[PDB]
Amino acid sequence: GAAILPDLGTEILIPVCAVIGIAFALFQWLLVSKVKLSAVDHNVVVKCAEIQNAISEGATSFLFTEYKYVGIFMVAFAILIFLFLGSVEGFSTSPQACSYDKTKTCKPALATAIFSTVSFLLGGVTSLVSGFLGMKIATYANARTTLEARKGVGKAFITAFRSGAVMGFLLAANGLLVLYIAINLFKIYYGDDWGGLFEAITGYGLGGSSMALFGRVGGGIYTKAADVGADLVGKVERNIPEDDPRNPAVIADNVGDNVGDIAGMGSDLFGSYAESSCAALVVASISSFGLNHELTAMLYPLIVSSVGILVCLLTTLFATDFFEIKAVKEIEPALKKQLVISTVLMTIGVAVVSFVALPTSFTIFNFGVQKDVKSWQLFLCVAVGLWAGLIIGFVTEYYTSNAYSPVQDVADSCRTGAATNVIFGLALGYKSVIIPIFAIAISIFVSFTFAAMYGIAVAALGMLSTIATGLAIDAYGPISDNAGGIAEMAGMSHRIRERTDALDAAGNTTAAIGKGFAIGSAALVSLALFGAFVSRASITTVDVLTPKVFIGLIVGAMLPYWFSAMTMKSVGSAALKMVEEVRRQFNTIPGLMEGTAKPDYATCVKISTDASIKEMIPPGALVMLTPLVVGILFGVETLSGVLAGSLVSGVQIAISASNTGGAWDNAKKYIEAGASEHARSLGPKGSDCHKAAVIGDTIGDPLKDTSGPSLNILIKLMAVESLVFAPFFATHGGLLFKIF
Amino acid sequence: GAAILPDLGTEILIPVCAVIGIAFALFQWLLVSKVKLSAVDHNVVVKCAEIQNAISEGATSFLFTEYKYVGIFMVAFAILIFLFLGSVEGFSTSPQACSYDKTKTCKPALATAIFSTVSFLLGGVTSLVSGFLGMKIATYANARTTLEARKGVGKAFITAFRSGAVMGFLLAANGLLVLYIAINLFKIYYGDDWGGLFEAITGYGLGGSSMALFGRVGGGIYTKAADVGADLVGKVERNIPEDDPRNPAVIADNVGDNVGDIAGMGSDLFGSYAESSCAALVVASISSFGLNHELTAMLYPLIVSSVGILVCLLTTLFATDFFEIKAVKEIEPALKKQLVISTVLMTIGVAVVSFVALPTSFTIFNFGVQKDVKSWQLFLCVAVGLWAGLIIGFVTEYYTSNAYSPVQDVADSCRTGAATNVIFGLALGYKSVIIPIFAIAISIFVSFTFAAMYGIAVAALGMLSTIATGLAIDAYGPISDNAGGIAEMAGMSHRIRERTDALDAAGNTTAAIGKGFAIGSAALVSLALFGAFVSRASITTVDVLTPKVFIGLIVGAMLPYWFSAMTMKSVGSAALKMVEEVRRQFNTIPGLMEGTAKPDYATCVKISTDASIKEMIPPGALVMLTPLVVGILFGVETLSGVLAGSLVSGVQIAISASNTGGAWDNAKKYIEAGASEHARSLGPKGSDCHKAAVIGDTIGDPLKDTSGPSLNILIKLMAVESLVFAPFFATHGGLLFKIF
């Protein structure tokens, strides 16, 4: 009937867990504030701090500019939501029959047009705040982990990891607390209409990912224009070290890590968290939980996320307190232990939550029919996504860490030049999709079979249930990356850079793992939302063999390529400009190459700024307008096909791009470290094998930091966007077919 | 109702047009034989003959080796077809009610098993003959083109182009004649059972493309191992000309153009032709034409291809006798006009065919129901295919020719090194898919809407109705390529090479165009075959939102990545071996770098022979086993998703890979030619820009010549295979769902 945990217990447990997470983030920041520096050894400390500030200012300054354009576009788009959703019942103010049950009376559509607009703006704001907080902690932790590197890898690891945990706990706890509050606020207006309530709440996911789209693309173009320009002139052309202060692009580069890899990705992951919770809420709201107004069972997804914060806090302790890194080969294994521990504990967590927060039987909406489901089946839906995630992590590690043969062979292929390096790296990323796809399909089959779109949605959330940790291991990498850049720029000892290099290479693997979790969960939520879209738009069958569905399927499968085209070329063009800028400085400013004059950092910052702010617009436009263009002109059947093809096609290029790029970076890192004889035989730095590895690395740079990771957003965003506009498309869409 | 053209009329016309095409081919071969050479200056002549022989022997010898393996694979698979099909009705010899008309009696399913094996074997034999005859004309024409280049570019054009026409007309005529014969012979047995007759005839395409898959993959690995090795060591490492006779890999490189770009391609296109005709014939056989035994209308696709041959003969005369080339900038436009003229004349021919060979009204089988279709709508189905082809040609030219800005900016990006060449070449490929996809989507919509799977099929066929000319402009390219390999190897003057380079650049564009036609028609026929499969397998609805279909969709979308991983890895590995060997000869054979010692060519030929014969197998296994493993294990609904997914997904990567490869080749060719201030400034040969262009080109080599082009075969071959095995999967498959 109803569950062991009462509605009130749930109303308390969720925000408590949120505050536990925020508290624990604040505590970790406090620990990290113990490492001291300012700009007012000791000369070294002053240099770190001066470098931290330059970076800190650059990141702040670009986010402010980027957030200004995105906030304006957000406001415009919120108006389209209001207008389009408001037009379904001609802006009437009267109630009408429930979309989900014509025998009942529901709040007016116009109202849901307003609360959708509201949840949208909430999600956009929470997304910018996610990116921004992430950027604040990263640009605060970077120099601190550099200084801690003076004491050994282990101490630097620890401060990079605590700081990632600050980012992970703040975003997980925050995205959860804001949703919970918005649900409770909305419920005041909605009453017994839970359908209209969680329909309205859907705009939150749409707000998260809409903003994430620009954050990832804008940041991604800023950082990679710099990265490529810096590394090419400096390492390939001039034979100076990576991240050398004579290099005019290096500040842009390191600012880059913070505005892309940190702020773009914090947004992106908030988008994933939000869409997944929303997808689950929407199907539950017209299932037994929502129809019977059972609030615990209804908020099962938030209860899972709540218990996930607890599990991740416990998990974090293993890497920060219970264990110490003494040898570099211990870094990658430690990060991985974080995944294994959280997954195991979280399986326990989800079982307890399922025992306590669900009745043993209930029904789940299934394309018009109430399907009988058991709490043990729903446990299995969350679990399969949770384990699918771990699988994806293990395979990604295998294909991107330089501790294994796929990356070692890519490095090796450098002996025959850049061409063979690239060909091997491309083959590696292609090859890498196989198992993650099987994992995704298995977890689709199981969750779909057990609980239809609800099953699939909470399998997406299961995959993201350990997101505080996931964000911790990922945020850890750009912090480490900056740390080594500050070392080189501070003039510090050769062996400080060796330590940070080793943290950094582990970070490379870890970034590829986050992209995997983001692609796996995007595939799952997007499928759940596609199905919810189909119901909400009153389509009886999405029949692949009809002209409308098929042209949607093939065109939708083209979109990820069109998107990749724009974003690769933006980076290509901007990087070309950056190389010319860097060259100009080295060739023209007397004493630059000799270390006696200062480079002009601001000109490189500007090339990145201009290119990104300008070139983020078409890809953003492509993704946000496609559902509106196709929904209005062609209709819901054709958009159905678009969503299916973009999902299935988009994930392939997304996985292969990220793993290719990750593999070229770590192959280059392998040569740079010379930690085995095979690795030493490709060296030293500046060797022909090394330069071939650098060429691969910088082709990989836009693949994995601009186009690849954003593709997961192209897919999940079109999908929520379609669902939110479903009533409008069902009613007023399909124009070309109405006319002729 | 009868057409204006009687049945007997049709029976005469088709073989007559076949013969006319064979005669035209022979006449052209004869004209080309007027160019004299023998191995028994006049020193240039002797030398060209010797080299011509070394290529010819290497090409004959590789194909005999490949074709042996492939022929053994073919007999084995033929047994499998017989057993699997024969097992559906437990090998019974009794007649059964016709599934298309329960009042009639039809031939035993065992008969259809037997005849499917027979058509398969014809198709395989014809595909190997197609490739072999292609290689024989190319390895005859190549040196004759070198010699004619002594008189000028236009003379060398005429010889290469007459020689492509040899291949085009032989392949188109012979494929048409064999189909026509097989239909008449099977009819002797089937009599009035046209359903059985044409169900059995479908083996022909399956044998066509099974043989092609190995030919393309085998030939492709062979050629690119050689090419990457020769080019990287000779041009990038040792600063010697391309095709320098000092390079041990150059014989293997030039044999490679004949064994991949010619023999692999010829078989590939033959399978396109065979599948498209077969798909139109299966649907018509249970539509009014087949149910009413109306021979002319039944053979409408063959009549279309017969008229296509006449149209192409006419079109060929424009490039062969009526215009002459006197300047390098006229080569590409002459080649473009061949497609414009054939398209414009075939529009008229197809209008005529549609007027005389169809009743004005009839019905087409459509998912169990006879749909009313008029002959003018059928005209449009064929015509949208034809016109979508030309759109694809124009767009592909725009993206791959160095007369235009996309490639010139790709060459331009060399100014900043190999990493920017590759980022730009990658973005260009991705970008290039937009319009071809839109054209394919429009042809699907039009032909689907008018005439279901039949209209789609004859749309595939319409795109291929000008195949004799399509093959001629394509085959023209490798012949031209060899021509310049032979020029350099014969130590001919720089002027001869400049001419061949102009011919060869245009061949690069024309190869990309051919690939665009192969991919276009593959998408179309695969959709037609996918729909026909669904009927044969008794599926009521392929519904995307079912666990079975959806897991097939996403796994299907992954197959083209797994295939690309294997083929790219193979070329990479064989290339790496090739570089090692070339390096060793330059570094240890005293006098080789100075021209006083002969290299060892055979070793390079060996490395590429062993690699290709061994590595062709797994990718061939993956394509041919997937329908069997999926149909038997998961069943016909899952296989449906696999077909839809592989089609929509594989078409994106196939187009981008090919156009990217083509763009890198021509960006390089543009630095090589220095025909304008911008081009000159990237040179000269041996410059860092030039070497960056070479790096991009060699990375493009496996993309465009091994994995990219074979991908159309993956798609179209899984589709005809699933159809042939449909009755078997429908009865004995879905094991995993039966046991649980």
Ligand SMILES: CCCCCCCCCCO[C@@H]1O[C@@H](CO)[C@@H](O[C@@H]2O[C@@H](CO)[C@@H](O)[C@@H](O)[C@@H]2O)[C@H](O)[C@H]1O
């Ligand atoms: C619908 C659900 C179906 C359930 C069953 C699916 C699970 C089976 C996985 C098959 O995939 C394989 O995975 C890799 C294993 O990691 C590859 O091996 C490879 O083996 C090595 C051999 O040295 C290396 O070459 C590596 O690249 C690579 O791991 C292998 O090619 C690939 O096909």
Ligand SMILES: CCCCCCCCCCO[C@@H]1O[C@H](CO)[C@@H](O[C@@H]2O[C@H](CO)[C@H](O)[C@@H](O)[C@@H]2O)[C@H](O)[C@H]1O
């Ligand atoms: C559905 C698709 C069909 C799947 C069925 C698989 C059939 C297995 C065939 C076994 O024979 C193959 O052939 C070559 C020799 O027999 C081997 O390498 C070869 O080994 C020899 C050299 O010793 C050759 O002469 C070389 O050309 C070549 O590289 C190759 O590894 C081996 O696999």
Ligand SMILES: CCCCCCCCCCO[C@@H]1O[C@H](CO)[C@@H](O[C@H]2O[C@@H](CO)[C@@H](O)[C@H](O)[C@@H]2O)[C@H](O)[C@H]1O
């Ligand atoms: C059915 C689905 C339909 C959904 C419709 C979606 C509309 C999305 C608009 C995308 O258009 C892009 O924008 C740039 C125009 O701003 C183009 O030119 C260029 O723009 C330049 C900036 O002026 C440069 O950045 C580039 O080199 C680029 O080539 C680029 O070609 C084009 O693709």
Ligand SMILES: CCCCCCCCCCO[C@@H]1O[C@H](CO)[C@@H](O[C@H]2O[C@@H](CO)[C@@H](O)[C@H](O)[C@@H]2O)[C@H](O)[C@H]1O
């Ligand atoms: C050989 C390897 C092929 C691999 C395929 C594996 C699948 C196994 C399917 C076997 O099919 C059955 O075989 C019997 C015959 O062997 C049939 O009996 C039928 O056979 C007839 C005699 O031929 C009659 O006596 C009866 O109608 C009788 O029901 C029966 O219908 C049929 O379904």
Ligand SMILES: CCCCCCCCCCO[C@@H]1O[C@H](CO)[C@@H](O[C@H]2O[C@@H](CO)[C@@H](O)[C@H](O)[C@@H]2O)[C@H](O)[C@H]1O
């Ligand atoms: C899906 C249905 C959509 C229908 C759209 C129609 C598709 C056809 C697009 C083909 O692309 C065009 O081709 C021209 C070549 O024919 C180029 O012109 C070029 O023509 C040359 C020579 O005639 C040059 O001199 C010029 O630079 C000139 O830009 C042109 O730029 C290019 O974009």
Ligand SMILES: CCCCCCCCCCO[C@@H]1O[C@H](CO)[C@H](O[C@@H]2O[C@@H](CO)[C@@H](O)[C@@H](O)[C@@H]2O)[C@H](O)[C@H]1O
């Ligand atoms: C969805 C249904 C699918 C069912 C059909 C699947 C059957 C065909 C897959 C064949 O397996 C492949 O085998 C190769 C070799 O056997 C490769 O591994 C290889 O392993 C080594 C040994 O051969 C080397 O060749 C390596 O370079 C290479 O990675 C390759 O990656 C692997 O995938």
Ligand SMILES: CCCCCCCCCCO[C@H]1O[C@@H](CO)[C@@H](O[C@@H]2O[C@@H](CO)[C@@H](O)[C@H](O)[C@@H]2O)[C@H](O)[C@H]1O
């Ligand atoms: C309660 C929250 C759960 C979280 C705890 C985690 C452990 C449970 C997962 C294992 O799944 C099992 O559950 C049983 C059920 O408990 C089984 O039989 C079930 O048992 C009966 C009802 O409980 C039957 O009527 C059904 O048909 C059904 O097959 C089912 O086969 C089995 O694989």
Ligand SMILES: [K+]
């Ligand atoms: K990183």
Ligand SMILES: [K+]
């Ligand atoms: K060519």
Ligand SMILES: [Mg+2]
């Ligand atoms: Mg870098």
Ligand SMILES: [Mg+2]
């Ligand atoms: Mg970085």
Ligand SMILES: [Mg+2]
């Ligand atoms: Mg860095």
Ligand SMILES: [Mg+2]
């Ligand atoms: Mg990195």
Ligand SMILES: [Mg+2]
């Ligand atoms: Mg980088």
Ligand SMILES: [Mg+2]
């Ligand atoms: Mg070459």
Ligand SMILES: [Mg+2]
């Ligand atoms: Mg060649």
